[model samples]
Target: LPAPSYWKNERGSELLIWSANSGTIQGTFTNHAQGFACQGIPYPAAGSVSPTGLYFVVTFAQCNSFTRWVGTIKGSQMPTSWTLFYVNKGKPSRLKGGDIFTRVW
Candidate 1:
């Protein structure tokens, strides 16, 4: 998930996923040429899920990874009123640096 507010000069460099049913968290970091890895950005950051839709808010330290990202997931299940939600990838491995977190309103 991305933050509603961002630092104009930082780049997003990490990806994180939060489970609604379990409230669990999982994800990785993007290090320049190395791609996704288990390290880089730390975990247990503050975030929130959509109260009514399938969207989420993941707050991160202003970084390059978060700055360049500006898009949303189009899904039939995403509710228009919610700003947070979840994405259930068929498998965990299918979730990468860009496919993590969801709203749990």
Candidate 2:
């Protein structure tokens, strides 16, 4: 998969994700993360544009935790490219393959 864009707050540790297709921004913080490495979850509904528009699913989770956040976007109507930001509260976050967590999308 293409590398996700990354950003950090100059004043604090806050991650931001800028979508290439939709130009939408997604964010997460280390205080809420057990890990940083993340991948786009398989979205069976992807490709098929919803009445909304062309889009994909995104998911984030903490390492070995039962918590997660899931959401969707309309890439077709994006004004700019997309990116994923990583922010660590006190320490840098990390991501590895096969790690598992809960997601909604």
Candidate 3:
């Protein structure tokens, strides 16, 4: 199986992932200043490729908050790429930090 891709907050507050073989993705929301880590939180994710396009859904969770990530494949040919179009998070969200692509290996 392929390894998961990691997405992290550039400020070093959160780490999210999408496991290749798992139906659910998990992440940790960390607060170094507050000295806490919210770990092992699971979120639902789904992907599909059809004649129309490729679509994906990834929900990130921490504490009582949630952020949904939606992607649509875009490229000239096959093995296309995905970019996040929408993200919604709850109020009082602890992971109120910026997101960045950390690694994909």
Candidate 4:
């Protein structure tokens, strides 16, 4: 049996649960703000890791929101960026951000 990788964010309130065998990720992002209507949702997440150890994941079928993260594993840390894409009232919008995750690996 395989265990999930627990990655914690130091810059923000977030957590990434990654699977090495499947090369997929399932994470949670907590936005303790009022600007966005949706926050702290599990949402959908899936992606793949390359032989070189780089990986990318995206959240689909979300609550009027979704995101993507691209990163490479460095020791027990995941240094990645967040590309958030969603509908802004009517038109689609994109905001870029970053997160640093620490794991037990």
Best by TM-score: 4
> What TM-score fits each model?
0.25, 0.21, 0.33, 0.68
True lDDT of residue 45, candidate 1:
33
In model 1, state the lDDT of residue 93: 23
Tens digits of lDDT, candidate 2, 1-105: 011433322222233333333333333333222343532221111122234433233333432222222233323112212233334355544332221122212
lDDT, each prediction: 0.31, 0.29, 0.37, 0.59
Candidates in descending TM-score order: 4, 3, 1, 2
Q: Candidates 2 and 3: which is better by TM-score?
A: 3
Give the alpha carbon lDDT tens digit for every residue of 22-84 in model 4. 554444445434455555554445666765555455454544567677777777777888787
Candidate 3, 1-105: lDDT as tens digits: 123444433444333334534333334333333432334444554554344543344443444434433332233112323332222343342232223334433
Score residue 14 of candidate 2 by CA lDDT: 31
Q: What would you estimate as the lDDT of candidate 2?
A: 0.29
Give candidate 1's TM-score.
Answer: 0.25
Q: State the lDDT of candidate 1 residue by residue for 5-36, as single tens digits.
A: 21111233334343334332233323332443
Return the top candidate by lDDT.
Answer: 4
User: Lowest lDDT 10-mer window, candidate 1?
Assistant: 76-85
